[PDB]
Design a protein around this ligand. Structure first.
Ligand SMILES: Nc1nc2c(ncn2[C@@H]2O[C@@H]3COP(=O)(O)O[C@H]4[C@@H](O)[C@H](n5cnc6c(=O)[nH]c(N)nc65)O[C@@H]4COP(=O)(O)O[C@H]3[C@H]2O)c(=O)[nH]1
Ligand SMILES: Nc1nc2c(ncn2[C@@H]2O[C@@H]3COP(=O)(O)O[C@H]4[C@@H](O)[C@H](n5cnc6c(=O)[nH]c(N)nc65)O[C@@H]4COP(=O)(O)O[C@H]3[C@H]2O)c(=O)[nH]1
Ligand SMILES: [Cl-]
Ligand SMILES: [Cl-]
Ligand SMILES: [Cl-]
Ligand SMILES: [Cl-]
Ligand SMILES: [Cl-]
Lengths: 269, 270
């Protein structure tokens, strides 16, 4: 069973895709002739190639603009770097893992990535921080809180508030955000949306779209209409931040500025 | 002062032209995106490229039909040759000299509208087909044109029609499609939108979003309202299709059905 590379980060549709490295002169590139064809402008048309010498697989940079980087080390043009199991190869904004031994429908593809927020927030946070750092790509976090949630629980019981939390999560994930966006509950009454690739301005606009849609949605629990609004806070990862909760903390401070300004609104910074 | 290649023989206008080899990823080819773009049919679209490792400059053949030949020796596909002063590099019928010391816009965007050009679309189409095939993912195409465009030009002048094309494309590009969705002018007042990974249902929704937004938008040309609508045709790549123009042809048939069905509508090819 031949060695392979698996896409860790790449354009939509590519993550989890495996390419067997069966021979020398297999090329990673954005040219259609590439055996490892990745439709991404950060790759050169012919970016890097493989050399196979029995069991030894090496990668060679082909004079790429955005470099070939193995485990964080730049490989100079035409130099050959011997690969071993679990090495990471970064070519532009695409990152592969090398497997000494390599391993389909609509549900199987969505399982592959954990689309529509299957994952855990405590896993996804660190993933987003690592991605932002390795790609030098903006990462924004939007936090939301239900206004007057204690009043909802007092008036309709804890099961009423539970219904609202569960229903709000359902609507956001299934109707309002992209399948590769990550949305989760965090603590008692808060929600976190991770937007890898989104700068502050964009994150604010997404947060506001969600705020207005939730405001307009009819929450009916056991035949009774519950008024629901949310307050919103937005932050974008800074260079000095190393834990995702640091981004959350600033987003949460923005949220409570939104709440102390009259609630049912969005604040950025 | 960087190394360069100088054209010794080539098409008229090229001889004596020097191309600095200032970094890696400089490609010789007949594709417009090539840094060393030579308009000669004997060159491959991407023929050869350079690799720079400090003061060492090498050339790499990219599987070219007519070969990359350095001082009479053929360089096999994907192999490199370290260059030295006065080496001659022959790529098809064009010959360069390498000099250890030597002495335009590639965006492919329409001047009026800022959409991608027809030439860009002609390159992007094969890429979209390859992506659909390797990912086993739907590919959809939406095509449209402005209804009664001749009447707009007659009534408001050619600058009025120009305003409409430019404004319509501003709305589409900046408000209605994703930044990685590919939108191009395809002759005249026809436009093509490529939707990677999008089934028919999605493509129809995008087509309708565009049609409805344009219908409702105020095209105000020197204080006066121009009524603007578009007719839309939509198709989705079928399993047996191998060229993007096959998908285009079916979308264009749907567009003509839109025109014959009253205009200002979307038709999804049945
Ligand atoms: N206002 C706004 N809402 C957004 C945006 N991005 C995502 N959403 C919302 O989030 C829903 C799901 O997004 P999706 O998973 O990417 O799933 C989408 C996506 O795969 C596709 N799609 C829709 N519009 C476009 C488009 O313009 N370009 C491309 N490439 N795909 C689109 O169709 C799916 C369903 O689309 P919708 O029914 O509209 O359902 C959208 C839409 O309600 C945005 O940029 N602006
Ligand atoms: N990760 C993430 N980002 C979001 C989302 N919603 C909005 N955005 C981001 O916010 C930008 C502007 O959103 P827009 O005003 O709705 O303006 C959008 C919208 O009018 C339209 N559109 C694009 N995708 C969709 C979609 O899935 N559904 C609908 N109904 N419209 C879409 O095309 C415009 C430009 O789209 P983009 O270039 O992608 O630019 C988007 C995109 O970067 C979201 O749910 N998830
Ligand atoms: Cl390139
Ligand atoms: Cl290249
Ligand atoms: Cl973390
Ligand atoms: Cl060619
Ligand atoms: Cl017409």
């Amino acid at each position: 069973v031949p060695p392979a590379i698996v896409v860790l980060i790449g354009p939509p549709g590519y993550v989890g895709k495996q390419y067997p490295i069966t021979a020398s002169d297999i090329v990673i590139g954005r040219s259609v002739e590439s055996q490892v064809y990745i439709d991404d402008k950060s790759l050169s048309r012919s970016h890097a190639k493989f050399a196979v010498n029995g069991s030894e697989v090496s990668v060679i940079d082909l004079g790429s603009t955005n470099k070939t980087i193995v485990n964080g080390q730049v490989i100079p043009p035409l130099a050959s770097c011997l690969l071993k199991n679990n090495d990471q190869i970064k070519t532009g904004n695409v990152i592969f893992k090398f497997l000494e031994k390599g391993s389909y429908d609509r549900a199987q593809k969505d399982a592959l990535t954990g689309a529509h927020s299957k994952g855990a927030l405590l896993d996804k946070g660190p993933e987003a921080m690592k991605r932002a750092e390795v790609l030098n790509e903006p990462f924004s976090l939007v936090t939301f809180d239900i206004d007057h949630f204690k009043k909802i629980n007092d008036s309709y019981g804890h099961p009423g508030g539970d219904y609202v939390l569960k229903e709000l999560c359902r609507i956001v994930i299934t109707k309002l955000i992209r399948s590769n966006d990550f949305f989760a509950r965090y603590g008692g009454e808060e929600f976190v949306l991770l937007l890898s690739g989104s700068p502050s301005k964009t994150a604010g606009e997404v947060g506001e779209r969600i705020r207005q849609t939730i405001e307009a949605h009819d929450f009916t629990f056991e035949g009774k209409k519950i008024p629901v609004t949310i307050s919103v806070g937005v932050a974008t990862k800074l260079p000095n931040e190393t834990e995702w909760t640091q981004v959350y903390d600033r987003a949460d401070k923005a949220l409570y500025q939104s709440k102390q300004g009259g609630r049912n609104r969005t604040t950025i910074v």
